[PDB]
Structure formats: structure tokens, C-alpha cells
């Protein structure tokens, strides 16, 4: 049988935080849920350490969205609110099977938008430079289609040990940390000043697959939403 995300302590403090999308945006388990033992196969405990995220399909999502502590219900936070908001995570990106192409790890999401995704992806040029098998930072700075919304960056090469983020919003500008070292240094999301529907993801969120049949796989060791007003 499969063994519970929570009957370890160690994402005790984020599953009070956050409730269970699967397969789509729907609703799949509630903070109270995810805390007394809710367990499937895309989202389970691995090796008796990892909280693992399987998903298949274009589009679909095994994903964990931020909420307000306690049984609370949907947070919403703003870049420009004067507060740091953080998300802290250590993730082992399995080798992703065949049909896999990109998958979304973290999130800094709004009601209709991703302010920031942090994907894996399997073979991208960026910026006239051919990258495979790497984690990638796509920043939108406008909600059109061309190049111009975005800033797309390389973070790192997938390695097989665990791998540590940070992603930290203050005043309008973002920074992401991997494996302690400062990769996007105050990045400018002052497209979203007044946007005030913002929240942390985290998990497997299929993107662009050549199967859908095909399952994503992504373990976390570690993740938490760092309150700075404690």
C-alpha cells in the first residue's frame, strides 16, 4: 500500500498551507485532507522521505497551492505589498521517462497567470544557446504571446541529487537562489503592482508532452512557504 505524504513530520508545516490540485485546477484534497492522511498515486511518500507529484497528460497537474494556514481559505498577496514572500524547496528531478518534455516544479501564480514558473525541460534554446536536461525560470512581464512577455532563463542542469530553490518577491522585484547561489538577482515584476491574487505552487504541472500517456515524476524533500511576519 502506499504510504501518506503526512505521516512523516518533515511537509507538515506546508500541507497546512496549501490544498491538493489534481488532475486539472479541481480540487483534490483540502490543508485538513492533506494533513489527516490523504494519499494516491500521484501524490504519495517515496523512500519514506520524499513527497512525490505523478502526473500524465497535456496540461494536467499534481500541485500544491499556497493558502492561508490553519483550514484557511485561498491566500492572495501582492509584489508591491512591502512584504518578502518566500517559497523554499529541495526537489530530486527524476530522469523523466519518454513523452515527458517539461514539467513545472514551483510556482508564483496569480488568478488568471504565471507570474513565474520553474520547469524542468527536456531540450529548449534560449537566447541562441542550446540547453538539455536543465531547470529553467520563465518570468512573464505581460500576459501577450510574444517573446517579449517573458524572461526565459537557464537555472541550472538537472542533477540527480537534490537540488535547493528559493524564490523570494519583495517590492516588486524577484530573485531566485539555487543551491545557494543567487541565479536571478531582482528580476522586475512591476507588470503585477496591484495584481493581488498572487500565491506559491509547488509540485509536477505537465507541460507541452509528446504523450499523454506518459507520467511525470518529481520527489520533494523539502518545501515550505517562509513567513517573514511570523
Not at 531540450?123 to 524572461?151: C, H
Not at 524564490?167 to 524577484?174: A, E, Y
Not at 547561489?181 to 515584476?189: E, H, K, P, R
Request: aromatic share 10%; net charge negative.
Amino acid at each position: 500500500f502506499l504510504t501518506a505524504v503526512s505521516s512523516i513530520d518533515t511537509f507538515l508545516p506546508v500541507l497546512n498551507e496549501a490544498k491538493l490540485q489534481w488532475p486539472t485546477s479541481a480540487l483534490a484534497a483540502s490543508s485538513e485532507e492533506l494533513l489527516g492522511g490523504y494519499v494516491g498515486s500521484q501524490f504519495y511518500l517515496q523512500d519514506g522521505k520524499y513527497m512525490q507529484f505523478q502526473i500524465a497528460g497535456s496540461s494536467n497537474r499534481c500541485e500544491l497551492r499556497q493558502m492561508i494556514p490553519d483550514g484557511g481559505s485561498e491566500i492572495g498577496w501582492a509584489v508591491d505589498d512591502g512584504t518578502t514572500h518566500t517559497a523554499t524547496s529541495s526537489i530530486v528531478v527524476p530522469e523523466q521517462v519518454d513523452g515527458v518534455e517539461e514539467v513545472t516544479i514551483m510556482q508564483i501564480h496569480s488568478g488568471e497567470a504565471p507570474q513565474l514558473r520553474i520547469s524542468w525541460i527536456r531540450s529548449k534554446s534560449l537566447d541562441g544557446v542550446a540547453y538539455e536536461d536543465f531547470i529553467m525560470s520563465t518570468v512573464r512581464i505581460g500576459t501577450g504571446d510574444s517573446s517579449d512577455n517573458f524572461v526565459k532563463t537557464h537555472l541550472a542542469d538537472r542533477t540527480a541529487g537534490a537540488m535547493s530553490f528559493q524564490i523570494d518577491v519583495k517590492d516588486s522585484k524577484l530573485t531566485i537562489t539555487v543551491n545557494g547561489n543567487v541565479v536571478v538577482n531582482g528580476q522586475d515584476l512591476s507588470f503585477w503592482d496591484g495584481t493581488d491574487s498572487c500565491y506559491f505552487k509547488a509540485g509536477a504541472y505537465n507541460n507541452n508532452p509528446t504523450s499523454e500517456s506518459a507520467t511525470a515524476r518529481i520527489k520533494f524533500a523539502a518545501l515550505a512557504w517562509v513567513d517573514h511576519h511570523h
